[PDB]
């Protein structure tokens, strides 16, 4: 439990390599943090989290959990 979870192999099964997984998780974490920061305002922008979280959980851990659960998609622009 902690940095060890979720297992890296399960995550890599959902992406191409480590280099893409880093960017994918980081972008989702930035989205979650941006949603949290401007929650006081009544705003419709950014979404999540899509899983049950704790009182104060790092957004990167939540992003990795959603990625493992398979609730996200990645496209190429």
């Amino acid at each position: 439990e902690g940095i060890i979870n979720p297992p890296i192999d399960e995550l890599l099964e959902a992406t191409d390599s480590k280099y893409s997984l880093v960017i994918y998780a980081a972008k989702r974490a930035r989205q979650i943090n941006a949603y949290y920061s401007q929650l006081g305002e009544g705003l419709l922008e950014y979404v999540g989290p899509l899983v049950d979280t704790h009182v104060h959980e790092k957004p990167l851990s939540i992003a990795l959990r959603e990625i493992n659960a398979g609730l996200l998609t990645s496209e190429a622009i």
């Binding site: 060890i4 297992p7 192999d9």
Partner: protein
């Protein structure tokens, strides 16, 4: 893992660790390394 059944020096341990890393996921390998460390210390204290 198949039963080992032979004296384990440092070459045999290297072979076993390489096989574990080759055939198993990383979490299981880390847990096995921790188990080996703990048992090694415990039985080295009583080694004589």
């Amino acid at each position: 893992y198949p039963f080992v059944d032979y004296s384990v020096g440092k070459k045999q341990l290297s072979e076993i660790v390489n096989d574990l890393a080759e055939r198993y996921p990383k979490v299981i390998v880390a847990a096995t390394l921790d188990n080996l460390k703990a048992a090694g210390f415990y039985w080295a204290t009583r080694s004589g």
